Scaffold this motif. Structure first.
Motif, PDB file in Angstrom:
ATOM      1  N   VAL A  43       0.874  -1.186   0.000  1.00  0.00           N
ATOM      2  CA  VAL A  43       0.000   0.000   0.000  1.00  0.00           C
ATOM      3  C   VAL A  43       0.899   1.219   0.000  1.00  0.00           C
ATOM      4  O   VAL A  43       0.837   2.036   0.934  1.00  0.00           O
ATOM      5  N   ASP A  77       5.160   5.410   5.321  1.00  0.00           N
ATOM      6  CA  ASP A  77       4.335   4.645   4.366  1.00  0.00           C
ATOM      7  C   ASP A  77       4.854   3.207   4.239  1.00  0.00           C
ATOM      8  O   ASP A  77       4.047   2.249   4.179  1.00  0.00           O
ATOM      9  N   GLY A  78       6.170   3.038   4.180  1.00  0.00           N
ATOM     10  CA  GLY A  78       6.733   1.664   4.049  1.00  0.00           C
ATOM     11  C   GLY A  78       6.415   0.813   5.269  1.00  0.00           C
ATOM     12  O   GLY A  78       6.089  -0.388   5.129  1.00  0.00           O
TER      13      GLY A  78
HETATM   14 NA    NA Z   1       2.383   1.710   2.658  1.00  0.00          NA
END
Ligand code: NA
Length: 291
Positions: free
Chosen positions: A73, A273-274
């Motif tokens: 995502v 985000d990762g």
């Molecule tokens: Na992500």
């Protein structure tokens, strides 16, 4: 400004139902079902097709992401986001309201609220109580097709609301930012496995504190009050006057920390985000811990 003037992050089911009745869905107001479920469970698009807020579109997070990334995502490009949301009738002037069908009341909706903000759009809110409470209250649902007219959206990355692997690694050393992880406690501690992956260990990044995302909601699935939310941060030794990075499995439930903080007047929470999925694959094992 010492504090930016914050746009409403929550709207009520009553407000949204009044808006829909008044014919406000259009260029000025767009409504998104952002539900996503782990494989072998619920069917997000089918559920949307059977029952949605009248005029709502399905926001497909499986599509609106960097599909070339090895990680989960990840944000799409500015152009990818702008093309997709323009196809749903969203322009830079549109009030976007996001909901999902989570059984408690919220899972993916805050991620899409953050996506709009990280692409420079402040006019975005989540439906407080989710589709769970839309349904429970008996508000109108339809299976009629939504066909919004296309719009133009300009996406501009606000890098202050995003963190990269490299910035989180620098922060191990700098300790400039508090790192807060919204995964369930067992996964954070390493006593429960990470699901829906091969060979992904559980545990957490050294120095991070755990704020499981479901603690931000009441049993009925509504956001806790700003006074309750502030107390939760204080009891976890998270100082809302100091910099904060939120992380989780894949950058989704981390956005509940960002939403909670925003309702407490702190809009500057950045999302890794990762998240753990990227961290475990990239980082040295010395950087993380597991029981
Ligand atoms: Na992500």
């Amino acid at each position: 400004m010492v504090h930016q003037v914050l746009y409403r992050a929550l709207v009520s089911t009553k407000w949204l139902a009044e808006s829909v009745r008044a014919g406000k869905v259009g260029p000025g107001l767009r409504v998104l079902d952002a539900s996503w479920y782990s494989p072998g469970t619920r069917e997000a698009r089918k559920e949307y097709l059977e029952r949605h807020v009248p005029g709502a579109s399905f926001f497909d997070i499986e599509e609106c992401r960097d599909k070339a990334s090895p990680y989960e995502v990840m944000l799409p490009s500015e152009a990818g986001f702008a093309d997709y949301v323009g196809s749903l009738g969203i322009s830079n002037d549109t009030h976007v309201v996001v909901y999902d069908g989570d059984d408690l009341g919220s899972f993916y909706a805050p991620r899409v609220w953050w996506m709009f903000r990280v692409f420079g759009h402040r006019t975005v809110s989540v439906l407080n109580g989710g589709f769970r409470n839309w349904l429970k209250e008996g508000h109108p649902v339809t299976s009629e097709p939504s066909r919004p007219e296309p719009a133009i959206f300009k996406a501009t990355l606000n890098r202050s609301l995003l963190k990269t692997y490299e910035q989180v690694l620098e922060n191990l050393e700098s300790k400039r930012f508090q790192l807060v992880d919204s995964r369930a406690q067992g996964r954070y501690l390493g006593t429960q496995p990470e699901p829906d992956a091969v060979g992904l260990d559980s545990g957490h990044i050294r120095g991070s504190v755990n704020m499981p995302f479901m603690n931000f909601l009441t049993e009925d699935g509504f956001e806790k009050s700003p006074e309750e939310l502030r107390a939760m941060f204080e009891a976890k030794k998270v100082d809302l006057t100091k910099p904060l990075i939120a992380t989780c499995r894949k950058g989704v439930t981390a956005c509940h920390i960002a939403l909670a903080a925003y309702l407490c007047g702190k809009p500057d929470v950045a999302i890794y985000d990762g998240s753990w999925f990227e961290w475990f694959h990239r980082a040295p094992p010395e950087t993380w811990v597991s029981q």
